[PDB]
Point group: D2
Chain length 116, copies 4
């Protein structure tokens, strides 16, 4: 998959399961168009969002719905979501892993970008 999302829970020491993720792409008119969405698995991973054909150059936003996640575990968290915004594929196709590590009042995010 050219775009994968991995989410971990820093309170539990576990994958963050059933986390909703929405991906948008910036359009020519500067609006954020819905691009793909899904939920993390029991491993904290979300694959199958897009294809190399569909995943063209652009500015992408990966919105991780952390508030909804924490509001199931009895924690009232600080953030509404964690948003990751980046230019993709502008030197040709790459594979992207967007990883996030969640706490109620904090998160960490990183990217792993590989050239197939």
């Amino acid at each position: 998959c050219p775009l994968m999302v991995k989410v971990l829970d820093a309170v539990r020491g576990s994958p963050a399961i059933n986390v909703a993720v929405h991906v948008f792409r910036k359009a020519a008119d500067d609006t954020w168009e819905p691009f793909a969405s899904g939920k993390t698995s029991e491993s904290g991973e979300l694959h199958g969002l897009t294809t190399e054909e569909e995943f063209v150059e652009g500015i992408y936003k990966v919105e991780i719905d952390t508030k909804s996640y924490w509001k199931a575990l009895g924690i009232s968290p600080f953030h509404e979501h964690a948003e990751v915004v980046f230019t993709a594929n502008d030197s040709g196709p790459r594979r992207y892993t967007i990883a996030a590590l969640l706490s109620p009042y904090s998160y960490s995010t990183t990217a792993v970008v590989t050239n197939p």
Copy 2:
């Protein structure tokens, strides 16, 4: 003030100086309206964004222009910016510090909310 932003650089081990920061408040129509902005100081801090009177409950977005920061240092970064979106709630503590720790391909953010 009731809102402060602190930005640190994980590559150089220092404050992130002269970083542009824009704060937006979510309007009734679900658009982001400009609220406050500035550039971080030599200590990586931006104070004076708002007052207690203006900083009412609501959803706020703090956008940190990380891409320009890295580019000015001659380093190629991943993100367009770092986004921190949160609800201000009067039931909680009264002073909010949004802190961010920057790397070219990663960032960490936390909130320190005190009375």
Copy 3:
């Protein structure tokens, strides 16, 4: 594997490859005994450190040699290493992933603990 180590590079947006890792276990006399060691692969991962038989209860230290890593890439880093110290297997066998995300003056570490 009951003990895995994953290391990422926050400057490059890549796995951190060829990172030396030394694992110690606290002995009855309170000294740190060498337990296992290895290097991260091209995926940033180190598997094969131990077996479920060998990986008994104890206090373990996972030392990630971050300074040696950064001193190959032309960065003089801040830390000597990143050390992760934890009690393992004290409610029976678990599988542990120790993950670290490295920058020259900072690191993040987390654990993912699963019950097979």
Copy 4:
């Protein structure tokens, strides 16, 4: 002072208060000798650890007793402590802040080194 420690809590969004911190200096025989210690303040900070005269170049270890912190809050943590080991170098800036951001199964640490 030349050495400060700041500790934050990522679960509660606040300073980590009353956390024990021990600082060690590496001796010639490769053992860790006690150097300074204290407990973080209400602002999560520990100042007054050393002076410029005593804080010579060398390898130092800052051990943060995270396990006791979490246990006092009734939360089960992963780590025994958080360790930060570094070399003090006179060629670099003169003031070192060791910051740590704590969660039960994770921590982040950074160094802010300034003049």
